Write a protein that binds this ligand. Sequence first.
Ligand SMILES: N[C@@H](Cc1c[nH]c2ccccc12)C(=O)O
Length: 394
Amino acid sequence: SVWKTLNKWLPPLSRDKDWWWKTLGPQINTLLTEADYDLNERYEALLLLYRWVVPEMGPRPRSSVAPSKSFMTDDHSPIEYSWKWISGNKKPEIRYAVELVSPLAGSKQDPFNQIPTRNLVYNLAKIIPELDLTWFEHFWHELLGPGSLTKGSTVFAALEMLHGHLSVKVYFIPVETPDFSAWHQIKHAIEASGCLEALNHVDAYLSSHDDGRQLRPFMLAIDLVEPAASRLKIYARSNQTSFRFVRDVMTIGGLRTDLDRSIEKFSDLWKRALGLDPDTPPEDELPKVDHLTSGAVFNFDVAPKSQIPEVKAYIPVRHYANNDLQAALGLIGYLEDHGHGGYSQSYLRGLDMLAPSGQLDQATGVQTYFAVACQGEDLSLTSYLNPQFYAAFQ
Ligand SMILES: N[C@@H](Cc1c[nH]c2ccccc12)C(=O)O
């Protein structure tokens, strides 16, 4: 085991950092091993984890009560893994998002817990040269800086191990005021970035469409590459849960055509993963669940390369499915029905590793979202996983 070797030989850490190491290391190593990553990449992932992530995770979990209301996960776990399924018998891609913390979180020196994420990004930039911080600095400055109701967090980072190299993504969650909505801030920032037809399409949809007006933008994500190559993803939530609504948002009210076959496949997967009745009418709503993160969630890639924006829909399994085992088996049934299930048992072993002792069959929580994108006639799927350090304190 790569983690066992590194733990045998790296210098021992203090109580909190060591707990985080002996918890996150085995988890990330297990996921990468089930995704068949090369040994060297496993070593790199865990050495990054040991030097830059573990020291900045804060105090170790000690109760079912989290020391923050972090927006990363519903139980406020500050880590979220994700397992992207790749077509054509290829290996899955492993990514993990982290919200680092410091004893200054909440003080007037860092009231929204932003400095550790900044430092992490700068450290990575110093080590990996391919990272570009021009747009990070722009959007940080416009959304979190000295000018700038809270979702519990305002920034976090994501490491994508792309089999060969590492990419970084940054998420800004604007703080809203009665006069400046999150969407207001994100639109003004993007318009200042120096790109804009796709943004205008999203603005028209959100402002004047009957189903677009039910979306509330809340997050912006960028990649730390050259700004011409970076994606601009705007995340939007709605109280609506009918698949008729999800389909219309996927089509942006019809701006996107040539999506009929993939949306049929999407309806199949939606009912399969959520455990719905196969004859469920697309007009029907999911049974109501009141929660800060309930409802349908979507992202709109509004990057200048695109002309028309692209949409990714997130099936919220933690809120509308019956249990993680049912949801995972439904997703895997869809994937294997389309020849994309070479790593189904690897995914299940990862789930069992992440799952609270004996709860895959009884509860939701491990899988947070199944993200769906319509690539031509097929689907692109991503499973988002929550380690549940507090909902399931071991
Ligand atoms: N946890 C928050 C933010 C978030 C993290 N990862 C996400 C992926 C998709 C949508 C939202 C998120 C939410 O569910 O909204």
